[PDB]
Design a protein around this ligand. Structure first.
Ligand SMILES: NC(=O)c1ccc[n+]([C@@H]2O[C@H](COP(=O)([O-])OP(=O)(O)OC[C@H]3O[C@@H](n4cnc5c(N)ncnc54)[C@H](O)[C@@H]3O)[C@@H](O)[C@H]2O)c1
Ligand SMILES: NC(=O)c1ccc[n+]([C@@H]2O[C@H](COP(=O)([O-])OP(=O)(O)OC[C@H]3O[C@@H](n4cnc5c(N)ncnc54)[C@H](O)[C@@H]3O)[C@@H](O)[C@H]2O)c1
Ligand SMILES: NC(=O)c1ccc[n+]([C@@H]2O[C@H](COP(=O)([O-])OP(=O)(O)OC[C@H]3O[C@@H](n4cnc5c(N)ncnc54)[C@H](O)[C@@H]3O)[C@@H](O)[C@H]2O)c1
Ligand SMILES: NC(=O)c1ccc[n+]([C@@H]2O[C@H](COP(=O)([O-])OP(=O)(O)OC[C@H]3O[C@@H](n4cnc5c(N)ncnc54)[C@H](O)[C@@H]3O)[C@@H](O)[C@H]2O)c1
Lengths: 347, 346, 351, 349
């Protein structure tokens, strides 16, 4: 991550009012980038957006990505050189009760974003965040490789598989490598999941639910204790997104493809483990009661020189620290900035 | 194809004002089905819709499939037991010019249709027409199998790949074969391409262009003489769609998957040959100056489906249909007889 | 198939005393090629080898392909420009009772043949006959494509999958396309199955057994009347082998890969129908008396069609008519050497 | 790995005179197994076989696995319950000049072994060592999964792909999990590569050559400083082989398939760093002079179904390599030293 590269860059971020978007926006701000965000009002209360004062250091616009023209104008007005598309209906459970809204937001929203970029021009790098769930689920023990089939069982997962197809076609049709000397836009998709960190209040997700139980000194009710997942601190995939954006900007079409970001497998553990480790780090008032989808990230490692930095223990520790600070009244804007620095200064 | 099965069935057809939709609607009408169509105004002039008087024997509604509520009510008002979704922005060329409209129409339109079916209830069989182009193109000599990856280069092809994904998720989430005893809806997708026949006036389409030249007693100049495409008369895939619909209705979820329909590879012919045959079929006033394919073993083995007309026969009927159109023949009755001739084959 | 091309070509054929090998040898002879065969004594009595006088118009050597040096010498002595490797333990049933012999014959036999070719030099085209059974069986309704995985359940099928691997490695290591300008050898494998025709006296094979029944005016007993197999007249895949050989010779490494040869699936006919058609072609003295399979092994032959311009010539009915004809002429005492030559001519002249 | 399980077990090991075979034989001996080996004379001088006195505590037979009858009689005489097939022509380079012998040894040798087992009867577990190179090489960045295509460019790699096919057919035809209740034989294949450790004197091998230079106090000349290979101490895959053998014996056909064993990719290190660490570990007298992918395996199956996992990172492994070699040079009893190394491994985590 080259701080000097980000200084002064005009970066447009959809979904800046969310969990991942907030951390990314804060990170970009600390590196001196000129950032503009486009999202609906923060999805939860509390929210990282408000607690870490994400809006104060950037141009923040509230809008629906399904509003094709409003989005077009937002990008035209800003003239970004780099775009991170993170806005989406991210909940599986909810996708079952609101499938239409999930497809319109995740598929058409992506179409409208790419169309805006196509017409506005000048965008050098586009990083479209889809999901680790975009892959046709084979229900096997192996991590998915980027060249495998897109799909998805539930509307959310499937809409992300569709978003991947959309990005592929837009790239081939309007941002083709052979014509890169003309349009100059390098478009890529990034696939990652099981993101955890301080500031995520999407309760239905395990970690946020755990932290809420702990704060109330009430036992957290674990659904599937034996469920194994590849947990990773939110800054891990984000570091990959930033690294990729840099390569897309400076090197070009060579990196305009799909990319997996995830933790080392030897790190993955069952939810039972996560909770137990967290209980220890938290201390008093912490208790509980009662194959797997993963990605092969050899491509990011071999072609981007990417690698995670924090093991699960370090990650869970930072989580407890962040949440306890928030509860204690600490300035979470500065605290979050320091967390980014700690990550950045970890080698 | 049980002529008796279709009698009285309430069939809803999106895209009934188009080429394939018109032939399907006419076919359903001749078999005694109660048909309702939902489409935008016929895409061309002339059109099979008007020339073959498709609307006469059915309920015809003009509406946009992107209008979620209008579609919902149209289906609720009709209470169909069988649905054929054929409405879509079908042009590759146009998709490069209007990518957004292509995705909204082909992807969201399919989403709105399935959502309507989900809420209205009572639908027993759903046949969603996607495209032979829904497959991620490996650009090889082999015909694609139904279990291979979805994708698509251009917005049109890609939107069809997306439509396949959408249908798969809706089926798994809301019309799961495991819960068939509850919802009773068998949902499938059908993949076919290179459809030709009398009554198609889409521009830039090879066959229609050849006829456009003939009717103008002007020589047609071909640009790709060696190009091979698995051409098939429009009634060939439609017969497969009807056969599948019957199976979905009577047998159920066992057939709720994706299905390829296409001609036998041995029937594969280059355009130069196609032009020659057509010139010979037309007569005076006619002159001139790997490839994507599908493996249809599944339709054959599980549906007992199989093509009926070789390319020659198809080209002959194409010329017959068109020359008759120019001659002032009643194309509604002529088209009905064509369907009967097809049904009689074998 | 260019008859002119074969005139004077030195062709070495292993398995010339067998069913497919005999028809191929006879075909090569009629086109003026100088042929030498290397096989064990004909596998059955009667045999096409003896009934059609296969040896009379060629050099016929009896030897085991598992005898590395004897095979090397037989080849070095002959200096062939074209080689067709058809010798193998071809029975699945037997492979269960003699797995070791199956592997030694099909795998090491192929290794010894390729090694001999490597050292003798001068060979321009090598066509190694493996089997339609070389593919890892996915138990599905689709025809296999040449780029799919090799394997095999039983020792025979598996040994053929191994023969494919062996040929691939020998080509990559010693007959690499990148070095064609030096060695000049174009090596390929051909995959085909369900071959039928006059002159096959293998045991427990439906067509031959049907003829044996007709032969003794005994009703032919049928077990699974619904059984389907992509049957093809022996000359169909052989025409493909010859076409490929010519291309390997004249064009080179461009064709040094694996190739599928089979009939059109539209030709797929169950056994009951087959028996019925043969009963009709046979006439007086023919009759017949009585688990289902969801799928049957088949091949996708788009590659041969597109890249070689290959195409089958006879539907099953036509083929069955020729089968019955060949048999009764044999039974009547007809000169089967000349009869078989005419059959080859009829095939070449078809269309 | 259950020491009590191995006590008294009759284990037959082909290739016991080699590098991997010697360590495995020593390991089996320390756990109380009754071991018999069948190999050609040790391939090198020096050899682990002689230096670590591998033959002392076992029945050692010298024979060619291409001698179908001799191998048959060797197995019949011993009546093993567990068999580890490690004998093979393991060199890629040699396979180019001797392809026939490579195929005869690796393919027919495997056929003869399985045929012997088929007829002798009583064998409960068979672990056939093939190679990480049995996979059709796509030349990509991803680790191969057990369900992917067999193949191989060179005769050695290809012969291992063939050995996999042979084992699959023999299992399906004669040791089918469907009638395990009859034959009682659970047959599996194990795929692993880039094995390093004390006692390997194979020629033209990076680690052994580094030690050859160090032992002569001469700089080692490095020609491929950036080359990366999933190096692993010899005891790592062997622990997997032993664990699998136990499961095949006790649980049965459920484990009669192919299995990958390798190090974690996060452990991937280029030869330059390897030479550096080794120079540091050796000390006085050690010195050196100066593609976008590499063949690797996905070992999720071994992890998930066998509960297997690597125990030593590369650094720990290199330290033990240097230690083993320096002790050998110092006149240390390498039989006891090697036994202790096995114990150290068993004690890890
Ligand atoms: N957190 C994870 O574990 C995980 C796993 C896979 C994928 N993702 C993806 O990462 C992105 C960020 O997810 P997150 O965890 O921060 O979720 P989040 O809910 O905290 O953030 C989602 C953002 O999307 C915006 N948004 C949603 N619908 C919108 C619409 N119609 N118009 C405009 N903005 C809209 C929201 O306002 C919000 O800022 C999403 O694309 C999500 O699918 C997250
Ligand atoms: N004809 C072919 O060769 C071929 C090949 C592949 C796929 N298809 C598919 O078959 C179907 C029929 O194609 P066709 O050749 O008859 O084309 P067509 O253009 O003649 O018919 C298209 C129909 O779609 C309807 N439609 C389009 N957009 C609509 C919208 N927004 N709202 C409502 N109705 C709308 C039109 O009114 C028309 O009736 C399409 O789904 C097409 O993608 C056809
Ligand atoms: N006929 C089919 O339907 C079919 C299907 C797949 C593959 N094949 C393959 O085609 C080839 C020809 O089969 P076929 O039907 O003519 O069978 P066949 O039994 O009539 O001919 C086999 C030939 O192999 C020779 N042979 C066998 N073992 C030998 C050995 N050790 N040394 C030397 N020669 C030996 C025999 O002498 C004989 O000439 C074989 O490779 C067979 O596996 C045939
Ligand atoms: N060491 C590695 O990195 C690696 C990588 C892949 C595969 N392997 C496989 O692991 C096994 C052990 O290899 P290794 O490193 O110990 O090699 P090695 O050369 O040290 O041992 C090979 C053993 O094979 C025996 N052998 C060879 N040919 C024989 C024959 N014809 N008859 C009887 N015995 C014969 C030798 O006598 C020796 O004991 C082999 O199967 C090899 O292919 C090793």
């Amino acid at each position: 991550i080259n701080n000097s590269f980000w200084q002064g860059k005009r970066v447009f971020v959809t979904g800046h009012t969310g969990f991942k978007g907030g951390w990314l926006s804060l990170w970009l701000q600390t590196m001196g980038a000129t950032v503009k965000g486009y999202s609906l009002t923060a999805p939860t209360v509390p929210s990282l957006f408000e607690t870490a004062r994400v809006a104060d250091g950037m141009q923040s616009e509230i809008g629906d990505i399904r509003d094709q023209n409003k989005l077009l104008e937002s990008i035209r007005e800003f003239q970004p050189e780099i775009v991170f598309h993170m806005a989406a209906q991210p909940l599986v459970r909810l996708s079952y009760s609101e499938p239409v809204e999930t497809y319109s937001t995740n598929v058409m929203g992506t179409v409208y974003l790419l169309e805006a970029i196509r017409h506005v021009g000048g965008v050098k790098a586009v990083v479209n965040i889809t999901s680790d769930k975009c892959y046709d689920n084979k229900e096997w023990i192996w991590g998915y490789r980027e060249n495998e089939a897109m799909g998805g069982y539930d509307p959310y997962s499937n809409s992300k598989g569709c978003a991947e197809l959309v990005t592929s076609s837009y790239r081939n049709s309007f941002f083709n490598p052979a014509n890169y000397g003309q349009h100059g836009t390098a478009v890529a998709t990034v696939r990652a999941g099981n993101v955890i960190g301080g500031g995520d209040w999407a309760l239905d997700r395990i970690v946020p639910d755990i932290l809420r139980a702990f704060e109330q000194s009430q036992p957290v009710i674990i659904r599937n204790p034996h469920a194994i997942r590849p947990w990773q601190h939110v800054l891990e995939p984000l570091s990959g997104y930033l690294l990729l954006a840099q390569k897309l900007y400076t090197d070009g079409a060579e990196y305009a493809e799909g990319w997996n970001f995830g933790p080392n497998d030897a790190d993955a553990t069952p939810v039972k483990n996560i909770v137990e480790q967290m209980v220890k780090y938290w201390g008093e008032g912490a208790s509980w009661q009662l194959h797997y989808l993963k990605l092969d990230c050899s491509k990011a490692k071999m072609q981007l020189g990417w690698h995670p930095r924090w093991n699960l223990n370090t990650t869970l520790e930072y989580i407890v620290g962040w949440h306890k600070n928030w509860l204690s009244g600490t300035d979470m804007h500065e605290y979050s900035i320091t967390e980014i620095n700690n990550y950045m200064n970890t080698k």
